[PDB]
Amino acid sequence: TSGFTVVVKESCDGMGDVSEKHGSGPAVPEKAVRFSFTIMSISIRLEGEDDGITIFQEQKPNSELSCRPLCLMFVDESDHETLTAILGPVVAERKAMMESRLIISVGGLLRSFRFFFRGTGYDEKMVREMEGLEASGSTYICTLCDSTRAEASQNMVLHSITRSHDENLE
Amino acid sequence: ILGPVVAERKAMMESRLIISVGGLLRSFRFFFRGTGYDEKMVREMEGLEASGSTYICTLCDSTRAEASQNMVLHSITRSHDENLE
Amino acid sequence: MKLKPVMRMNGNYARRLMTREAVEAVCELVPSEERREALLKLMDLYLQMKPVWRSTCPSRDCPDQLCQYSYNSQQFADLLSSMFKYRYDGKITNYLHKTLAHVPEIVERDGSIGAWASEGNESGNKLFRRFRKMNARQSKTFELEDILKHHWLYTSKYLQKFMEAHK
Amino acid sequence: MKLKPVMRMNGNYARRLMTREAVEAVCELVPSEERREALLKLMDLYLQMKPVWRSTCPSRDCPDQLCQYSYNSQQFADLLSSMFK
DNA sequence: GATCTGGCCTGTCTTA
DNA sequence: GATCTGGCCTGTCTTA
DNA sequence: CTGCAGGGTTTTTGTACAGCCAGACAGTGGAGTACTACCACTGTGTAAGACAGGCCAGATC
DNA sequence: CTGCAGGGTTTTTGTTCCAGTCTGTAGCACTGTGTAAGACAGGCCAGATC
DNA sequence: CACAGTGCTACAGACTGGAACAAAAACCCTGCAG
Numbered sequence: 045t046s047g048f049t050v051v052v053k054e055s056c057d058g059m060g061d062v063s064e065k066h067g068s069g070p071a072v073p074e075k076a077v078r079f080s081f082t083i084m085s086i087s088i089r090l091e092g093e094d095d096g097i098t099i100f101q102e103q104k105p106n107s108e109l110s111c112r113p114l115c116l117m118f119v120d121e122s123d124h125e126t127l128t129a130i131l132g133p134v135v136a137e138r139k140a141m142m143e144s145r146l147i148i149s150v151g152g153l154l155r156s157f158r159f160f161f162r163g164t165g166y167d168e169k170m171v172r173e174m175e176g177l178e179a180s181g182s183t184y185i186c187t188l189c190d191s192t193r194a195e196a197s198q199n200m201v202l203h204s205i206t207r208s209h210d211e212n213l214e
Numbered sequence: 215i216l217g218p219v220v221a222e223r224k225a226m227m228e229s230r231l232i233i234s235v236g237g238l239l240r241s242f243r244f245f246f247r248g249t250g251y252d253e254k255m256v257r258e259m260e261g262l263e264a265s266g267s268t269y270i271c272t273l274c275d276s277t278r279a280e281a282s283q284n285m286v287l288h289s290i291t292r293s294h295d296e297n298l299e
Numbered sequence: 300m301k302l303k304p305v306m307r308m309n310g311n312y313a314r315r316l317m318t319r320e321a322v323e324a325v326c327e328l329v330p331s332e333e334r335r336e337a338l339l340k341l342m343d344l345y346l347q348m349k350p351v352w353r354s355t356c357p358s359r360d361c362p363d364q365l366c367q368y369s370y371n372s373q374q375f376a377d378l379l380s381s382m383f384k385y386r387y388d389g390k391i392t393n394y395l396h397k398t399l400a401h402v403p404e405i406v407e408r409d410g411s412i413g414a415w416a417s418e419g420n421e422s423g424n425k426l427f428r429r430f431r432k433m434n435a436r437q438s439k440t441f442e443l444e445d446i447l448k449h450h451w452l453y454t455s456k457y458l459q460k461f462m463e464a465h466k
Numbered sequence: 467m468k469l470k471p472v473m474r475m476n477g478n479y480a481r482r483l484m485t486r487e488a489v490e491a492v493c494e495l496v497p498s499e500e501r502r503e504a505l506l507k508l509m510d511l512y513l514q515m516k517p518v519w520r521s522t523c524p525s526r527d528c529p530d531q532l533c534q535y536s537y538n539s540q541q542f543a544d545l546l547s548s549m550f551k
Numbered sequence: 552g553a554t555c556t557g558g559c560c561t562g563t564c565t566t567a
Numbered sequence: 568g569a570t571c572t573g574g575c576c577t578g579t580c581t582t583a
Numbered sequence: 584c585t586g587c588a589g590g591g592t593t594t595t596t597g598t599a600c601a602g603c604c605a606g607a608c609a610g611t612g613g614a615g616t617a618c619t620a621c622c623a624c625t626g627t628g629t630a631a632g633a634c635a636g637g638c639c640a641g642a643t644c
Numbered sequence: 645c646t647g648c649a650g651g652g653t654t655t656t657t658g659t660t661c662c663a664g665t666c667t668g669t670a671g672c673a674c675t676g677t678g679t680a681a682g683a684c685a686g687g688c689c690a691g692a693t694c
Numbered sequence: 695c696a697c698a699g700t701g702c703t704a705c706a707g708a709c710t711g712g713a714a715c716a717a718a719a720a721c722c723c724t725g726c727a728g
């Protein structure tokens with residue numbers, strides 16, 4: 045029961061034209077940002093040996109039936125200051141969490157989960173803006189590669205993915 | 215599209231309706247008041263020029279200037295028949 | 300094709316537009332014969348490489364398109380820089396590059412793509428609008444609270460299980 | 467007054483706009499103490515003539531405002547053409 | 552040279 | 568006179 | 584044939600015995616019930632035209 | 645007395661088909677949620693040098 | 695090769711009846727057995 049592996053797809057995307065309420069306060073911009081996730085799969089490994097072993101896999105991930113909202117905000121996508129101010133804690137629990145394994149009481153017994161987080165759901169402009177890139181039409185097109193605009197003009201079909209988090213930090 | 219509807223109303227006003235209700239047929243007269251329009255559209259259906267026109271009132275004949283001079287004294291004139299004439 | 304113009308183009312009008320028979324109504328417009336053949340051929344190339352990254356898991360559902368994707372993209376890019384170069388000389392849309400370059404690699408790595416799409420987010424936004432009207436409180440203070448809660452409740456499996464009514 | 471800026475004047479923000487409170491909140495803004503008196507008294511006049519038309523049947527629910535309407539509107543018009551001309 | 556008319560462009564208003 | 572650099576406009580592109 | 588009037592017909596409508604189960608009444612102490620205001624606060628009104636004055640363009644003499 | 649074989653028995657349980665009658669679903673052509681900025685290039689006038 | 699629907703349609707599926715067949719369930723029985 046202790047060798048589980050949980051793969052969680054998380055996604056965050058903004059939304060425009062949400063009208064403010066008269067209300068009391070405070071003053072808030074129109075645009076609203078919805079931060080969510082979904083559990084794509086949960087698998088097992090132990091005793092050792094064989095691979096990892098799927099158990100549950102979301103059959104229709106695209107359905108709005110399974111998307112778990114987490115952080116709900118009124119924030120303009122453009123201002124970075126506030127976006128990082130509110131989404132800061134959330135990211136902190138994520139990167140703090142990747143290390144530690146969970147213990148739940150389920151099916152009567154105490155069992156343990158590993159979590160593997162893949163944010164795959166972000167649109168290109170957001171990926172770029174949280175990754176510090178120049179959006180969105182800048183000479184460097186590929187979020188995944190170092191190719192410039194004109195260099196990706198002559199050559200197209202041959203490319204090698206480089207860009208990754210730690211590398212962007214350095 | 216709203217032509218047939220008007221023909222309905224106008225042809226309807228003279229007639230009385232006979233409905234069997236509570237077991238007994240009974241005769242109703244209908245009095246139609248269109249009251250719920252925004253003025254822009256009032257101005258349209260009755261042919262008035264709109265909506266910032268020198269003649270402001272749908273119900274009165276006063277211009278902007280004459281309605282500026284004396285505000286509180288006016289007499290309703292405008293109605294359908296006179297408007298046709 | 301029974302289609303009407305859009306300001307911003309939704310993916311639905313993209314699914315009607317991408318089909319071959321959609322490229323048929325336009326093939327009739329272009330006077331030139333070989334051009335008419337060129338863009339048609341291009342579109343069939345595109346229909347062949349689309350299910351790879353659209354489908355949830357191509358490793359089973361659509362194997363042959365996957366294995367041929369590199370070669371198929373090669374062919375595609377060749378056709379572009381061949382007859383269309385005037386529009387691709389120094390400029391390429393981010394996605395055309397991304398879809399013609401790094402797709403086989405990421406499908407090899409994640410195992411699959413499009414199951415990971417933004418769609419499972421995005422769609423949810425619809426709910427956020429109705430849950431901001433029907434189920435809202437409604438004042439600025441509590442509103443996000445009860446939207447969020449009610450959304451969470453909407454998402455739970457435990458309830459959907461009940462609402463299947465077991466056939 | 468807890469009222470957001472507006473796109474278009476909707477009737478709701480139009481009900482929270484004209485009340486004595488809203489005016490006394492915008493009374494703090496204009497420095498001239500004569501004008502405060504003027505627009506304030508103006509608004510009270512308006513509050514007095516508003517239920518006349520807006521109420522369903524003024525003959526019952528607001529009779530005394532109704533009987534005073536002409537005269538009230540008179541003070542109103544005289545105040546506009548005098549001070550706000 | 553200089554009218555008149557119409558012009559656009561502005562430029563405000565009122566309803567929507 | 569006539570560079571420079573910036574400045575704005577424009578010009579298409581490119582994302583949402 | 585109509586009109587009403589003795590009684591027919593069958594069928595209602597209930598009272599007649601006598602025993603007996605059900606659930607209401609009434610208590611309780613309060614349980615936790617169910618339905619209540621109350622609180623700020625909202626959504627639907629959404630695009631044109633008329634009118635004044637300028638003044639430059641350009642035709643006409 | 646036992647054991648099981650193989651019959652008696654009634655009584656489940658379902659069987660084939662033709663009129664229909666209700667009920668749930670697939671067929672329809674088709675919809676919703678992705679909605680705002682910057683980057684790069686070229687020209688050229690302004691404006692400061694000197 | 696997004697997905698939950700979008701109403702009203704389409705007629706698929708759910709029903710009876712006697713006439714009679716068969717199989718199976720769980721009794722009683724008699725048969726042949728130590």
Ligand SMILES: [Zn+2]
Pocket residue numbers: 185186187188189190191203397400401
């Ligand atoms: Zn790349």
Ligand SMILES: [Zn+2]
Pocket residue numbers: 270271272273274275276288
């Ligand atoms: Zn009038």
